[PDB]
Design an enzyme around this catalytic site. Structure first.
Site, short mmCIF file in Angstrom:
data_model
loop_
_atom_site.label_atom_id
_atom_site.label_comp_id
_atom_site.label_asym_id
_atom_site.label_seq_id
_atom_site.Cartn_x
_atom_site.Cartn_y
_atom_site.Cartn_z
N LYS C 8 0.85 -1.18 0.00
CA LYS C 8 0.00 0.00 0.00
C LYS C 8 0.88 1.22 0.00
O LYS C 8 1.79 1.34 0.82
CB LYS C 8 -0.89 0.01 1.24
CG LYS C 8 -2.09 0.94 1.15
CD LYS C 8 -3.15 0.38 0.22
CE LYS C 8 -4.54 0.64 0.73
NZ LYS C 8 -5.51 -0.03 -0.17
N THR C 68 -4.35 -5.13 1.25
CA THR C 68 -3.62 -3.86 1.32
C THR C 68 -4.28 -2.88 2.30
O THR C 68 -3.59 -2.16 3.03
CB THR C 68 -3.38 -3.20 -0.08
OG1 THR C 68 -4.62 -2.77 -0.65
CG2 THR C 68 -2.67 -4.17 -1.03
#
Lengths: 315, 315, 318, 309
Positions: C8, C68
């Site tokens: 991320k 994520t």
């Protein structure tokens, strides 16, 4: 083992009427078989390297310093004399020329971002046709390349070569099974159109193929872009990870002269505001974006083709 | 009069499968006759106005304040209920809805920048065709609109309506001139019978009958894409003597094709390329850009058509 | 040797009232000895790695996939529990925490760009003072760090540690001897104020120093920025190349616990339009065409030792 | 009544060692009383207007066209000859000079965005001091101005004058309730653009600096009011910032505002131990002007809550 280089960036170079790129390999995913090169433009960045540059830093001695402005001139003049048709070919040409001119250098690195133009449709007395005079500056995806040439025992060689297409942004208007624990967001999932950014790169088994002297062996970034779009359209993907694996396999399948295909992605998928996708309304999410980095190699393709249970399919 | 308004900006609203825009006027400069609206997306900005908002500023009294977050919800929910096909239609719909809901408002202003997507080509078993699933986010030119509606004794009225195409960037390699200008001690620019012309265009227009922008009769709706195609066609065909000269002819042509428009307006920028190798190789200039603001009206077109000295031509 | 990671990015995380960084080394080039950390904010980017992630790509198998979004939550929650005072400390803390939580991961990489805030002056009933309530979001130079931790057979280890300051942009309102050939621009040179962009990074001999547990051994990016500015001010530089060598030497001199300092530069110097009537008095400049000079260079403790051992050295420090 | 103008934008102009701005009014909100002008730099944008420009568009006739490149040269040369100390003064000077040179122009408009530099601290043999040689390019807030001059029967006059400070971004580490609740209803960080207008426009020229309002002073007022006031909304805050500016500078007729609300989302509730993050893109905004009449009313009203240092 110190870091040491210097050069000039944002060297914009716009060559008009470069030799056309013609005779690319026909593939089912694309209609792109030539690039006319009426404008052959890029943003180039050159870096010079060599042990003999040390005293330019340690002593302020400019005696062996090629002025950065001179490097700019060198690149722009070589854009006029270049007789090839590809970005990689131009960069290798320039790298080699720098080394031929400046014996005290040991390596030269060129990076370039295409300054991209679209063909456009114009109305004429002959009807609506493609203009040969006016082009749109595109702020969409663009071709990239990097070539670094260094001296060798016998002469010079390309020690790094990269080719790619940057900033593909595609949405598809039509994911489960993750780890669930205390860090999982406590909210219900909604379906949204998968929206992805892709940077795709590739490497050649024979780097001379990037020069375009035999265009049947040259991989145009536009063809790769068309493969990515076609696979995204056709595949029922299980994830971005799964999708890029299949895009990579397909590129390797069409272009056996490539050793690998690499990816950098973003997941840019919207948030749902009104559930439908008929009648649905979405909006932009908070900033955090998922991303993936992955390379696919010919060994992966050979394994899939030899496998009894492969899901890989190609047109 | 005091300046006083408040609202929400960057209200991204992405409606899927809006009513298609179909049945546009056929013109020689364009093949654009429909916009499928599979994605109908925009970045909206809403501002509320009213004398009754004063104490929200002067006393911090929020009693008559519609929260900006609530405005966002209002817009997004109306994106789901909208049954039309045009940006202008949607904005007017929302303005009128705000006024109907909140009696203490005197006026509502909506501005929008299209969140544009291109149709793309994909390889299939039936050959290379346009995808109906996958679209490219375009960072090129985009549609704009503004509608402001004020309350009146009899109901409501539109007090501003704007329509446009923003950020057209076109190069014409050769053929454009710039000579004949003032030569004094401040003039260092060399006159040119032929210099590369790179233009940035924002073009707007106004309707004689504002309801035409709602698209309820698409034969009277002017699509920004058609205007873009006219601009490109004129740029291609006209031997321009400056961007001033060019935009006059673009404006005339738009007015000629769409008699229901009262004016065409231009906010434009100009940047030549610097020559580095004469034929050619060019590069980016220093930052300064020429710019122009100009409007063309039906009276100008009438004058041109009746003049024995006119150079105005159209397909 | 396949490339394989996922994560991320743009994980903005803004912790309020983190433990202050206090007790930094006093140096002549700087007054910066503490960073209050009233806002401890950054844009973080996390990448997870491990051979066990392969089938998430090759088979679309999400079984071993940490979502994520979950990574984002992980980082944000650890920002609340972190008790240290440094960016590098926080990143290593998070890397190790990910590895402790998820046994199937082989390595975790965190990168961060400070979301910088300036202290500002406000008028109050006690006069003009520094606000403890209001801060300016700064779009100027900002602190950077990277930490990557990998599993070993007997625990974990840091496999990359980076520290830096990004986007220093300085002009001095005060170069010859180059190769001259057919590629030289045929025009007379004019004097312009040297205008430079600098990204500076450093590495620690003892990586735990970056955690700030003994702040006397922690090198604050602000101190490095102040050294750079001070050297730019004092040195009669012969080039950007020459300048950054001396900035690097000075940083290494002040901080013996660093093994190297690295630089990425831009030359952003203006073009002359009107020559000054006396020095730069009455002079007018403008922006150049886009092309910019750049340099990449690292300076090492061995360089400083060589300068100190040399009778011909020009190196001087306060 | 058509729209018609042309000109040159991104005319970067960097004058070194311009006349210093000194002797500004002392106010409790600020220590800013001089601007040394060692660098006096801006991004200028000039537009020319005139009925006699029509055929440059309609006929492609460049006879009466001052080339935009020439406008660029004109501005840059006048930066060398300008002897004043303010952005507004420079812009008016250039406007007037264009009109004096080119009789066929009716009006000249200059807009400028400061190319801002910060003073910095350097260590020296005299300790840590402010450098007189090295400056930081600031990407933070910057000064703005616009001057447009047109002709009169007897000479010229200013038809628009604007002064401002752009891109102030401030957070306060320390309300919003009572708004409408209906079916649409579900750590303050603000962006501010502040502008002002002078009663006597010549005050902007800086010939008497006691009457010149430096944008840095206005910035300092905004920050000081943000620090001290318990605001009930950004709307409420900017009203008080505006009142305060008008109070300090009676020679201003009005102050105007353009704002953004950029407040973070909470991720971990505390602000000790609190963690926040960036929100989704939508931002609240406000546009508002405050006038001397508002201040006079506040200063006489028992209902007023206005206070100043």
């Amino acid at each position: 083992e110190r870091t040491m280089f210097y050069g000039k960036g944002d060297v914009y170079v716009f060559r008009t009427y470069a030799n056309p790129l013609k005779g690319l390999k026909q593939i089912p995913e694309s209609n792109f078989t030539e690039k006319h090169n009426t404008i052959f433009g890029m943003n180039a960045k050159v870096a010079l390297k060599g042990e003999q540059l040390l005293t330019s830093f340690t002593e302020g001695d400019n005696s062996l310093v090629v002025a950065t402005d001179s490097m700019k001139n060198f690149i722009q003049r070589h854009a006029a004399s270049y007789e090839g048709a590809t970005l990689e070919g131009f960069l290798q040409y320039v790298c080699e020329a720098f080394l031929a001119k400046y014996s005290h250098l040991d390596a030269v690195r060129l990076e370039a971002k295409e300054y991209a133009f679209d063909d456009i449709q114009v109305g004429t007395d002959k009807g609506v046709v493609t203009s040969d005079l006016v082009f749109r500056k595109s702020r969409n995806e663009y071709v990239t390349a990097t070539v670094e040439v260094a001296r060798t025992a016998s002469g010079t060689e390309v020690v790094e070569q990269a080719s790619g297409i940057a900033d593909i942004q595609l949405i598809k208007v039509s994911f489960y099974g993750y780890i669930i624990d205390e860090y999982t967001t406590l909210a219900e999932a909604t379906d949204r159109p998968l929206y992805i950014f892709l940077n795709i790169g590739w490497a050649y088994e024979n780097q001379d193929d990037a020069k375009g002297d035999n265009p049947a062996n040259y991989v145009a970034a536009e063809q790769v872009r068309d493969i990515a779009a076609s696979v995204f359209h056709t595949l029922d993907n299980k994830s971005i990870q799964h999708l890029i694996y299949h895009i990579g396999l397909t590129i390797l399948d069409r272009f056996p002269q490539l050793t690998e295909v690499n990816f950098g992605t973003n997941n840019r998928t919207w948030d749902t505001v009104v559930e439908g996708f008929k009648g649905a309304v979405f909006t932009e999410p908070r900033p955090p974006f998922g991303f993936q980095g992955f390379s696919v190699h010919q060994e992966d393709l050979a394994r899939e083709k030899a496998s009894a249970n492969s899901e890989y399919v190609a047109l």
